Amino acid sequence: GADRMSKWTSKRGPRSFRGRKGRGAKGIGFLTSGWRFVQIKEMVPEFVVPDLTGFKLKPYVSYLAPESEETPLTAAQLFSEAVAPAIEKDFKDGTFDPDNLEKYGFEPTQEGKLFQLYPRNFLR
Amino acid sequence: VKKGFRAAFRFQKELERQRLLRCPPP
Amino acid sequence: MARNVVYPLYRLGGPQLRVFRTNFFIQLVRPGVAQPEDTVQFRIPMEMTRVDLRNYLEGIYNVPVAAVRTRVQHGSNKRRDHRNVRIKKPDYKVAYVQLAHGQTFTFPDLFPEDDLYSMLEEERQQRQSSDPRRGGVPSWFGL
Amino acid sequence: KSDRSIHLACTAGIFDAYVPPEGDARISERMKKTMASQVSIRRIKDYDANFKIKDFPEKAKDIFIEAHLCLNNSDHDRLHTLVTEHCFPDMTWDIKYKTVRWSFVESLEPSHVVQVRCSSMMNQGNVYGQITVRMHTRQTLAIYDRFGRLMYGQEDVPKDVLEYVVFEKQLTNPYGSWRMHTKIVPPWAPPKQPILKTVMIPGPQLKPEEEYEE
Amino acid sequence: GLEEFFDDPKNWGQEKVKSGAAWTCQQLRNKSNEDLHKLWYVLLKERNMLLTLEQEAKRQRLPMPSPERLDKVVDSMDALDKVVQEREDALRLLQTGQERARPGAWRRDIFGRIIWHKFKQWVIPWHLNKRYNRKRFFALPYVDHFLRLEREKRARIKARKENLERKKAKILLKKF
Amino acid sequence: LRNRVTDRYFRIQEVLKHARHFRGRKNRCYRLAVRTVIRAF
Amino acid sequence: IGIRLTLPPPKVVDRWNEKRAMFGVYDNIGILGNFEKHPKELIRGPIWLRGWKGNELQRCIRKRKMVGSRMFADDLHNLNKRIRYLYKHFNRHGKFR
Amino acid sequence: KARGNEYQPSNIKRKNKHGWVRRLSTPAGVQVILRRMLKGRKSLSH
Amino acid sequence: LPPHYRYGMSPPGSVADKRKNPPWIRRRPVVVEPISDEDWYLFCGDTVEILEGKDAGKQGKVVQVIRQRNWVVVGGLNTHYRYIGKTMDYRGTMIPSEAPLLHRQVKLVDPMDRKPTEIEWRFTEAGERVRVSTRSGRIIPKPEFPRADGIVPETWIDGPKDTSVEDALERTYVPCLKTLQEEVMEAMGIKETRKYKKVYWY
RNA sequence: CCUCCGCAUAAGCCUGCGUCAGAUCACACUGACAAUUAACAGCCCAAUAUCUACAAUCAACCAACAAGUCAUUAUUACCCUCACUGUCAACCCAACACAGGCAUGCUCAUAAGGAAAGGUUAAAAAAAGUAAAAGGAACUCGGCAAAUCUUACCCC
RNA sequence: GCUACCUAAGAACAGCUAAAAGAGCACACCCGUCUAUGUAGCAAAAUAGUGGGAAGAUUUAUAGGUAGAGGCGACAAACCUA
RNA sequence: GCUAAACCUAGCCCCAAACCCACUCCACCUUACUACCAGACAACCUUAGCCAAACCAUUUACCCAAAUAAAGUAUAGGCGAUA
Ligand SMILES: [Mg+2]
Ligand SMILES: [Mg+2]
Ligand SMILES: [Mg+2]
Ligand SMILES: [Mg+2]
Ligand SMILES: [Mg+2]
Ligand SMILES: [Mg+2]
Ligand SMILES: [Mg+2]
Ligand SMILES: [Mg+2]
Ligand SMILES: [Mg+2]
Ligand SMILES: [Mg+2]
Ligand SMILES: [Mg+2]
Ligand SMILES: [Mg+2]
Ligand SMILES: [Mg+2]
Ligand SMILES: [Mg+2]
Ligand SMILES: [Mg+2]
Ligand SMILES: [Mg+2]
């Protein structure tokens, strides 16, 4: 009989089976005409690598560092530290319109945006 | 392992008897 | 490029697929067989494309790259444990990167040539071997 | 890289050996020698202020007699209390399957404390003190075989002995004691008693291509 | 270059290369996004160096000089990933109110189990999709007996675990 | 396996002690010993 | 050889446990308590075997009735096969007709 | 003639015959996979 | 670790422990009293008194705690003798070896009487759990053992790949309502004018 | 000395005689470390309508029957690249280092590939051959086997 | 995935006779007449020799089809995983 | 004196009680464990037989909504077996 316990890879099966299965690398283009491959640049991932000249953060931290209590960032903390000053400083001045929250940051829709948070359209 | 005590006790007295007829006491 | 993440679909006329924090991690490996002077061998993930190893090495390490070739190396499934269950050595991707501008790489040599242990060595050096003429007599009694 | 390490209760050597003087047995710089000693003796009394070097020699003789008597009955527990871990194997290993019959007849002359030296502190936080004591006694010895046959010595006959026994106590340890560490045999020592059997020393077992070159 | 895949040449064969503590998640929360991006690439180059060194140690049958460096760089980048994902999760929950980044649905299956179908990205709609309509998100009535037998097996395993729990407790109280 | 026989040894020896002067496997193998010990009695 | 070579671990018994010491108490609760309870209501066990004996066929018929509804499938099937086998054995086989 | 060489392997045949998609294609094959998950098999299909 | 693993003197993963406990070992489990973390009196470096066996009534410093078997290894005490370096017909050197002791075989000592006491855990005014004696009533602190990592703070000089405590703690994060991708694109000045069109998600 | 083999592809299998270290018919076993790199092969193609009678056989002559394996056009639409995967071995199906089974191209004649004898003695019986005086089917159910290479005739 | 029959699209067949062939000799290839060996074997049907066919109702690679109250069969009550 | 022999613990059984189990990421109905394309198909039919009737041909108990009792009673049934 055949081995039905190991992983089914692209190394097994006949020519057609071997060429039609891959290893999980994402596609960077399409196939046309005489099995001719057209690579599409926008489908090729571009590595956004920053300038590291003048950077003071090294891979390890000195052991002479004070211990800090862990505090996971919440949406409550983000609201209290990002838009709450604006809302308070606009209410005490008395110019809060409860219909234009767009000026405080609120995004009604995520459409038309380049980096939409739901459904996510951006890589890590 | 079988349950019980009586056969094990009998076997120990048999073992003690043979050890005596093997290395007899002075 | 990145592992284990959904990729945003591209419809013609759309933005560039950009990655910002890639989780692609490669190893420079000493070649087992003899290679040309321009060849650098890497072990890369299965989901890393040669277009992305070129882009990775030219973006993060600023290495001019002329050619990239890849192969899939199979790990053995022959080995068995005490339950007669086969243990799988993994599969990896090997990549051969040929450098540009006439540059040349050779793999360097990264490995060039206790009170208890000193106690053990001192006792071993103090303990002389038994004299044959002593016959087997204990050698401590001064008598 | 565990935080537990071996807690050694002795050392593996002799601290500044007493080169036995030629003529010490044939006849029936001193300030520096006895200076190193006094400096160290004070170190020992820093670690325990009830030590008298005038009181050591009789204790050393008692430890000697009782240790060597353990070798007669094989009391390895008492031996580990009157002798160091450095002295245990080279006192027991060659007697393991033999019968040792030892006795102490008398002492020809009283025992003398003849050297006191101490190690530094940097031995793992432990500081040891090592005292050399000369002995000239009269002992008997008869080492028997696995089958009860004589190999060495005579049963009743006492013979003279000169030994420079080096005792050691670990001073930092709270329950440390004075135990027998080694003994110096002089390089000028008299030759020992002949054994009771004949011995063949083999020559070179030669491979066939080799030639016997005398 | 490739000298950045290798260590400093003065560290080669030094049997121990000292290190520093891994980045703690709170410290990475103190730093900003752009600095976390740059630190991600610094830590990435360090991890590539350490993985290269570990593979060459395996090749030469010698111990790796200090594997704690590799462990601590993996912890540092895990903490960085955690911080960035928390910031995105907080903004997504603030702006859209959705608690996951990928869409999905609780659905049934051809086997009668309830699964979290994670959605895939398509160009045509679902009624026109061939492969999607070949898949069955419903259990026909011959699955209920196997569901009952599956539940009964889970009950037989739980009852065993809890009886042994009590037997082990009584054996402990027998000894002490 | 509640209630098993635990003294079968002593039963086999009660038969076997009367066969120890016999010749062959019947002096030690119970299945042949019994047949010959009943006949000796 | 099928006999222990050593003595078994000793089997110490407390004849004065709370359970041993109070065995049998309230077993005359009806005749000494104005017949308000029954010792069969003192019995604690399976719900189909409180104050009833039966043989094996009667026990199997009784359990399928009181708890065959709330019963696992494999164990119910096995009970049905057991009742069928015991019906055939008790009604058709034996030495005494 | 001589027997025993009745398995003439072919991956296309083995996947078309006893594979997951064929199994799920019939309800009885669905119950074959259900029977194997209940037994706890590590290879439900081929 | 495999179930019913027998903890011993060697750490679980060493060469001696891989020899003692192979992947196929199945031994009888060791029955261990369930002593919780909220009631473990023995720590490392604490001075205890051995009460049972040879070395009875004797005070030492514990050098190892194995919580999985309620074991303390007191430094130098409960000792047996074993050779080390037995390679050729060389005997090796006899070393003293410590056998572990149980928490009912050791008892903590109060720092003045230097006699066996009994500690009961009691929160203090600062909320610090503190070992309070039962005969007397003072506080025995947790003894300072060097560290688990092996890093001693006083002699810590940062190397070429360690970030300075100052830079490590420089707060650069202004909390905003934008993403790392959005911020990094603005910072690095990448420009994108093409719009991401709607994708049917199912 | 043998070569009825061989070398490739296909299918199948899936690290299965590469290096290092290590044991206990004769020394392909265990653990570790490596390796198969695309141009060969796989993986193809916008729509709607529309078009497509005349074999192959050296395609010529010629003869066929069983009557055959290879073709477009019109008008819209259309900018971009060399991705992904197979690539090792003494190998697969026959419970086995099984005298069996196993598609195609080349060599079929060897430039590939291999070894019938562990050592001796030289009894019977048995196996496989070679030679055999005179005779020549007398053998046997039968010229079975072997050797020659050979006539005529029944029944179905 | 054997085998019986079928579908789709493939492949192979030297040399000689006569040139018309379900023609003859004859390889590869397909089968299996007779004998000997083997009979827990090399083999749950093999080996050596001898044979039948070998341009045809041939042989054969691949994918597909028909399933048991059935299928399939140039009827042997054949074959449908020893 | 070789081969051996011994061993108590993994765990399990019957009850009681109590309503059991599903989103690290990613992948998975196509040749499952395959990023990414013009379709659509779709679930519901009385079990039967072994066996007993000493063959067998009508017939031959199979939880169906807490115990007990009425009661193996009325009834049914090649008025047989049996129900
Ligand atoms: Mg090509
Ligand atoms: Mg090849
Ligand atoms: Mg050759
Ligand atoms: Mg040969
Ligand atoms: Mg031979
Ligand atoms: Mg002739
Ligand atoms: Mg004739
Ligand atoms: Mg005749
Ligand atoms: Mg013939
Ligand atoms: Mg013909
Ligand atoms: Mg012919
Ligand atoms: Mg036919
Ligand atoms: Mg017929
Ligand atoms: Mg017939
Ligand atoms: Mg009948
Ligand atoms: Mg009958």
Contacts of A44 in chain C (CB under 8 A): 17, 51-52, 55
C54 within 8 A of C65, measured Cβ to Cβ? yes
Measure A60 CA to ligand 4 centroid, in angstroms: 69
The closest CB to that of A5, out of H9, H15, H43, belongs to: H43
Both tokens assigned to I93: 């050197």
Which of these CATH numbers, 1.10.357.10, 1.20.5.510, 1.10.1040.10, 1.10.287.3980, describes H4-46?
1.10.287.3980
Measure I170 CA to ligand 8 centroid, in angstroms: 124
Helix (H) or strand (E) run with residue D157 in it: strand D150-170
Measure A108 CA to ligand 5 centroid, in angstroms: 97
Please choose, from the candidates I9, I5, I7, the residue with its C-alpha nearest in 3D space to the C-alpha of residue I99: I9
D141 within 8 A of C141, measured Cβ to Cβ? yes
d(CA I79, CA D7): 10
Spatial distance from the CA of D6 to the C1' of J19 (Å): 41
**Quick check: is I162 in a domain?**
no
Distance from CA of B13 to the nearest CA of F (A): 12
**Quick check: is I38 in a domain?**
yes
Please choose, from the candidates I41, I39, I111, I43, the residue with its C-alpha nearest in 3D space to the C-alpha of residue I73: I43
Report angle CA E135, E136, E137 to the nearest 5 degrees: 120
Spatial distance from the CA of I161 to the C1' of J65 (Å): 90
Contacts of H38 in chain E (CB under 8 A): 146, 149-150, 153
3-state secondary structure of H40: coil
Dmax of chain C from CA atoms?
104
Residue I140's alpha-carbon distances to D24, I36, I126, in angstroms, are: 58, 19, 16
Mention every residue, 6+ apart, whose C-beta is less than 8 A from residue D85.
D8, D9, D10, I81, I93, I94, I95, I96
- Which of strand J's nucleotides are less than 7 A from any protein C-beta? 10-16, 30-38, 41-46, 80-87, 92-95, 100-101
The ranges assigned to domains in chain G are 1-96
Contacts of C128 in chain D (CB under 8 A): none
Neighbours of chain G (3+ CB pairs under 8 A): B, E, F
β-pairing, I162-163 with A60-61?
Answer: parallel
In angstroms, what is the resolution?
2.9
Measure I47 CA to ligand 7 centroid, in angstroms: 122
- The nucleotide whose C1' lies nearest the CA of H12 is L31
d(CA E168, CA E161): 10
Distance from CA of C53 to the nearest CA of A (A): 10
Q: Which residue of F has its CA nearest to G3?
A: F6
The ranges assigned to domains in chain D are 1-184
State phi, psi for I130 to the nearest 5 degrees. Answer: -140, 140
3-state secondary structure of D138: strand
Domain topology for D1-184: Nuclear Transport Factor 2; Chain: A, (3.10.450)
Domain carrying residue C135: 2-143
I202 within 8 A of E123, measured Cβ to Cβ? no
Please choose, from the candidates E96, E92, E111, E85, the residue with its C-alpha nearest in 3D space to the C-alpha of residue E28: E85
Domain carrying residue I86: 1-144
d(CA H45, CA C26): 36
DSSP bridge pairs for C140 = none
3-state secondary structure of E164: helix
d(CA I62, CA E64): 32
β-pairing, C18-19 with A46-47?
Answer: parallel
d(CA D200, CA C132): 8
**Quick check: is I171 in a domain?**
no
**Quick check: is I199 in a domain?**
no
Residue I131's alpha-carbon distances to I71, I102, I124, in angstroms, are: 19, 19, 10
d(CA F31, CA D72): 57
D171 within 8 A of D48, measured Cβ to Cβ? yes
D165 within 8 A of D180, measured Cβ to Cβ? yes
Using the Cβ of G23 and the Cβ atoms of chain E, whether some distance falls under 8 Å is answered with no
Distance from CA of C109 to the nearest CA of D (A): 28
Please choose, from the candidates I69, I76, I72, the residue with its C-alpha nearest in 3D space to the C-alpha of residue I46: I72
This structure was determined by cryo-EM
Report angle CA B10, B11, B15 to the nearest 5 degrees: 120
Q: Which residues of C85-123 are buried (b: 16+ CB within 10 A; e: fewer)?
A: eeeeeeebbbbbbbbeeebebebeebbeeeebeebbeeb
Q: CB-side exposure of E62: number of CA atoms within 13 Å?
A: 17
Q: Which residues of D108-118 are buried (b: 16+ CB within 10 A; e: fewer)?
A: eeebebbbbbb
Residue C70's alpha-carbon distances to C53, C93, D131, in angstroms, are: 10, 7, 74
The closest CB to that of H11, out of A1, A5, A13, belongs to: A13
Interchain pair E148, G74: CB under 8 A: no
Both tokens assigned to D41: 């003796």
Look up tokens 């590291």; give the residue: A52
Return the CA Rg of chain A: 26
Window A39-58, strand J contacts by Cβ < 7 Å? 39-41
Mention every residue, 6+ apart, whose C-beta is less than 8 A from residue A2.
H9, H11, H14, H46
Both tokens assigned to E44: 């990435």
Question: Number of structural domains, chain I?
Answer: 1
Q: Which residue of A has its CA nearest to C93?
A: A23
Order of strands, sheet of D150-170, starting from the edge strand that comes earlier in the sequence = D99-118, D128-144, D150-170, D179-184
DSSP bridge pairs for D140 = D103
Return the CA Rg of chain D: 21
Contacts of E149 in chain G (CB under 8 A): 73-74
d(CA D101, CA D105): 13
**Is the distance between the Cβ of C79 and the closest atom of strand J smaller than 7 Å?**
yes
Per-residue three-class SS string for chain I: CCCCCCCCCCCCCCHHHHHHCCCCCCCCCCCCCCCCHHHCCCCCCCEEEECCCCCCCEEEEEEEEEHHHCEEEECCCCEEEEEECCCCCCCCEEEEEECCEECCCEEEECCCCCCECCEEEEECCCCCEEEEECCCCCEECCCCCCCCCCCCCCCCCCCCCEECHHHHHCCCCCCCCCCHHHHHHHHHCCCCCCCCCCCEEC
Using the Cβ of I16 and the Cβ atoms of chain D, whether some distance falls under 8 Å is answered with no
Residue at D52: amino acid letter: K
